[PDB]
Structures are given as structure tokens and as C-alpha cells.
Ligand binder design. Structure first.
Ligand SMILES: O=C(O)CN(CCN(CC(=O)O)Cc1ccccc1O)Cc1ccccc1O
Ligand SMILES: [Cl-]
Ligand SMILES: [Cl-]
Ligand SMILES: [Cl-]
Ligand SMILES: [Fe+3]
Length: 499
């Protein structure tokens, strides 16, 4: 059976409501549900469920011409009415989509005919098409599967137009997908995909070694990185490591002592030998990051000055700010108060703990006492939401979220980035400029605004960028080369071709 594969995920795929978040898993929502326009690696979108579109003067009114040959997996038609109903269902839950500015921008969605769909916006929102292309929430479930003409209170069957259909799910055991034999587009070569629920990274590696799974595909947490490196030399196996997809960093709390001091945040940014951190904890598998966004990120090639590892400079910065060493102690003090910073992380995540131990050791060497606070996932999520941290691990979102959607979300108070930035004197100016950059028509102004926002965030040392991380693959050689999807959160199962 070379047209059936078995893979793994730490949890079940969830209900596969196209319009909700946890516990829905994005890769799976993307397997079943499809967008009007599809994101491509080059930053553009191509026609998808919409074959063409135009906008008014006045980029506020958009009219999409939809395909007329698409059916949902249950045989019901996809048309402008079905699409319009989906937009209504999403926007009936508007507050849950605040992070995504398109959700605050849509004023009206109307089916003008079976094939003409009209969307009107508040303002001329530039990233409109890219946001329609996201895994969620703007993808389409058969409206017959709404509950009481909504999706925010749940759905019936997870019926999409996509190339995969969920066959069955068993909580804490597995999820099975089958090829859609009535897909409007190209038939996948793979007919069946089974996801075994395997929460532990070493258990996932063991399941591969035993032959129990055929494919593992994910970020730096996919499997232990020492094991991945051994696998890459094993001629019985296939492995891949993509080019970097996003940044991993610390976020520093500018509203909490002692990270409220610019000098402290600058010093911390000179204290870490990132190459050593990566060679120590990540087995050399990732790239050093010195800016929030890699220079390859749209609008982010700004020539920002890196803070290279320089513990002499880190110490001098702290000294100048009045943090000095008592005899004969290693931890600096100012006004008799110790230079102590809490780093909270998920206590069961071994990679986080490994990185945190390295960070603690590096910062001790410059006289900062980092306290490691390892907690359960729920408590960490609460800390980020509410600003109850000194430092936390954080990551960017990858294409096409970076930079515009990541920046957009910095304005949302109940999230880590706003919370980390809350202490900055220029936070209001930053949030103003983020609003402006999303709305601006003037392309030179757009570049200037991105420059200013990213330059302030960099110069104010809000983050401590660590690494640009890659997607990783481990596979049975019989599966062949495994492609990557343009959207960092999607897995392109329909492009796998064992041939
Ligand atoms: O992540 C948040 O801060 C809030 N999420 C909005 C932005 N995410 C997009 C999304 O969830 O679709 C960004 C994102 C990008 C890439 C991978 C994962 C990911 O979540 C919504 C969100 C809400 C509840 C639980 C988990 C969630 O992700
Ligand atoms: Cl989740
Ligand atoms: Cl490797
Ligand atoms: Cl001072
Ligand atoms: Fe999210």
C-alpha cells in the first residue's frame, strides 16, 4: 500500500471547525478547507476558489468571480451564497478574530449572483488578499453543517471543498484522512493519511525507528535534535532541513523591573553567544538571529545593527546604569536590590529547558540572576496574556504572517508582544504607525513606517532574538523528496509523489 501513509501529531486534529482556534490544528483545517485565493512562495496570491477579482477606486469594495465547478465533499455546491454565509459566521464571532485586522475591516459580504461575491471594507486594507489566504478563519465549510446558522457555537460534519476528507478521529489515539475523490483540482497521489497521536518527541523518534510511522514533519520541536542529526547520517532514512521560516527569541518585559531599563535590555542582548547556544542546545541545526525578522523577510532588510556577543560591553552597560557587584558576590545590585530576572517557560518542554539553562548561565556571567520558572502550558499562556513575566520564549509566525500580521497583533493588549512593549514611552506611537502601515496606499510611506516600527523595536531592545528556525522532515526513503508549503503552518500532503 504505497498510496497510504502513517505520520504523527502530538494531539488529535480537533473538531475541524474552519473558523475557530484551539483545539483545532491548523495543518488539518488547511487539509480540508480552502481559501478564495492561495498564497505562493513569492508573496503573491493566485486564484483558487475565486478565479478573478477587481476592486473599486478606492480599494474598499472588492468583487470576486468564483469558480462554478466546485462542490463540497458532501456534494453540495460551493457558490457565492455559501461563501457569503461563511463570512457571516466568522464575523458573528468578530471579537475572537481581533488579532487579524481584516476581521475588523469587513463591513459587508454579499452574493451578487452564484459566481459574484462582493466584500466591502472599512478602509483600503493592503494585506486583504494575503489574509484571505490564511489557514483560518476565512475558509469555507458547507453551510448545511452550521449549527443554528452559525459556526461559533460549533459545527456538524467538517465538510470542506479541499483535497482531504476526515474519515474518523479517536481522542488521544489517532485521526484518519482520506483523499477527496471529487476534488475540483488535482487528485493527490496519496489516498489515505493516518495521524498517530504521539505527544513525546522521543516517542515520535522511536515510532519512526520501529517502522510504525512513515513521516514526521514539523519545526525544531519535531524530535530530539541529537536524534535528527544521527538520522541525517543514517542511509536507511531520509531527512530534510528547510531554509529558515521564522524567528525564536526572548521577549523582555519593558514594564517590569529590571527589564524596564533600556540599559538592562541592551546588556542582555550582548550577553548571549547565540552560535554556542545553537551548537549546544540545538545541535547546530538552526541559524543565529540578530533581529526580530530575518533580513529576507519583506520590508525588513533595514541594515539594523546586530548586538554581537560581547560580555565586556554588557558589563559596561550595566555598570553605567548603576548595577554593580558587591564583594564578593557574582550578582549585581542597585539600591541594594539584586539584578534578578524571571524566565518562565513550559516546564515539560526539554528544548525550552535546555535553552533556558544556557541563557541563565550566560546572563550570570554578566552579573544577572535569571530565575527559571518552568510551568504547565496553561500557566505560561496566562502569563503572556497578562504580562506576568520578566522574560519569555516567543516566536514569529512565518510567511505570510511576517511581518504585517505579527506587527498587527502587537496592538492587542491580551498578548505577549503588547505586554512586553507596554513600558515603552513610544508604545502609543508604535501602535499608531502599525495601524498606518496596514492602511497606507503610499508604498514609500509603507516602507518608511515598517522601517520606523522595526527600528524602534530593535533600538529599544524589546526582544532578544536567538535563532531563525527551520522546518524538518524525517521520512521513509520510499516516499521520496518531501515538499514544503508556502505557508509555514501547512503540510503539503497533496504534493507528495512517491511515483
Ligand atoms: O497565536 C496567537 O497568538 C493567536 N492566534 C492568532 C494568530 N495565530 C494564527 C492562527 O492561530 O490562525 C498566529 C499563528 C501563526 C503561526 C502558527 C500558529 C499561530 O497561532 C489565535 C489563537 C487563539 C487561541 C489559541 C491559539 C491561537 O493560535
Ligand atoms: Cl492547540
Ligand atoms: Cl542535520
Ligand atoms: Cl539610573
Ligand atoms: Fe495562533
Amino acid at each position: 500500500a504505497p498510496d497510504e501513509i502513517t505520520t504523527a501529531w502530538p494531539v488529535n486534529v480537533g473538531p475541524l471547525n474552519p473558523h475557530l482556534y484551539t483545539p483545532n490544528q491548523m495543518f488539518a483545517q488547511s487539509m480540508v478547507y480552502e481559501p478564495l485565493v492561495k498564497y505562493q512562495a513569492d508573496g503573491s496570491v493566485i486564484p483558487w476558489l475565486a478565479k478573478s477579482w477587481t476592486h473599486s477606486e478606492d480599494g474598499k469594495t472588492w468583487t470576486f468571480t468564483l469558480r462554478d465547478d466546485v462542490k463540497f465533499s458532501n456534494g453540495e455546491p460551493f457558490d457565492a451564497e455559501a461563501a457569503a454565509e461563511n463570512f457571516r459566521a466568522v464575523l458573528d464571532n468578530r471579537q475572537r478574530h481581533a488579532w487579524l485586522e481584516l476581521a475588523n475591516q469587513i463591513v459587508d459580504v454579499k452574493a451578487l449572483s452564484k459566481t459574484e461575491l462582493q466584500i466591502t471594507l472599512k478602509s483600503a486594507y493592503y494585506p486583504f488578499l494575503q489574509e484571505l489566504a490564511l489557514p483560518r478563519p476565512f475558509r469555507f465549510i458547507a453551510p448545511s453543517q452550521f449549527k443554528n446558522h452559525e459556526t461559533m457555537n460549533g459545527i456538524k460534519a467538517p465538510i470542506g471543498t479541499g483535497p482531504w476528507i476526515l474519515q474518523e478521529s479517536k481522542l488521544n489515539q489517532y485521526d484518519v484522512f482520506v483523499r477527496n475523490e471529487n476534488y475540483w483540482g488535482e487528485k493527490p497521489a496519496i489516498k489515505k493519511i493516518t495521524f498517530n497521536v504521539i505527544p513525546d518527541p522521543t516517542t515520535r523518534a522511536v515510532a519512526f525507528e520501529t517502522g510504525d510511522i512513515d513521516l514526521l514533519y514539523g519545526n525544531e520541536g519535531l524530535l530530539p535534535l541529537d536524534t535528527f542529526a544521527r538520522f541525517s547520517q543514517n542511509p536507511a532514512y531520509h531527512t530534510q532541513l528547510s531554509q529558515p521560516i521564522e524567528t525564536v527569541m526572548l521577549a523582555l518585559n519593558t514594564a517590569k523591573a529590571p527589564t524596564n531599563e533600556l540599559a538592562v535590555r541592551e546588556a542582555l542582548n550582548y550577553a548571549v553567544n547565540k552560535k554556542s547556544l545553537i551548537d549546544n542546545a540545538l545541535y547546530g541545526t538552526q541559524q543565529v538571529a540578530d533581529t526580530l525578522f530575518a533580513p529576507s523577510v519583506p520590508y525588513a532588510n533595514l541594515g539594523l545593527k546586530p548586538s554581537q556577543y560581547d560580555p565586556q560591553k554588557a558589563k559596561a552597560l550595566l555598570e553605567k546604569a548603576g548595577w554593580t557587584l558587591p564583594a564578593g558576590k557574582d550578582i549585581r545590585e542597585k539600591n541594594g536590590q539584586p539584578l534578578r530576572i524571571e524566565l518562565s517557560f513550559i516546564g515539560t518542554d526539554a528544548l525550552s529547558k535546555s535553552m533556558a539553562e544556557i541563557i541563565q548561565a550566560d546572563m550570570r556571567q554578566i552579573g544577572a540572576d535569571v530565575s527559571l520558572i518552568g510551568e504547565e502550558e496553561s500557566s505560561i499562556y496566562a502569563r503572556q496574556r497578562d504580562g506576568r513575566f520578566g522574560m519569555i520564549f516567543h516566536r514569529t509566525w512565518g510567511a505570510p504572517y511576517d511581518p504585517h500580521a505579527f506587527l498587527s497583533s502587537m496592538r492587542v493588549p491580551s498578548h505577549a508582544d503588547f505586554q512586553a512593549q507596554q513600558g515603552l514611552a513610544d508604545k502609543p506611537l508604535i501602535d499608531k504607525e502599525i495601524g498606518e502601515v496596514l492602511a497606507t496606499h503610499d508604498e514609500t510611506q509603507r516602507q518608511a513606517l515598517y522601517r520606523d516600527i522595526l527600528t524602534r523595536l530593535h533600538d529599544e531592545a524589546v526582544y532578544l532574538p536567538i535563532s531563525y528556525i527551520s522546518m524538518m522532515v524525517v521520512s521513509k526513503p520510499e516516499l521520496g523528496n518531501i515538499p514544503y508549503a508556502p505557508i509555514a503552518t501547512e503540510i503539503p500532503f497533496e504534493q507528495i509523489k512517491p511515483v
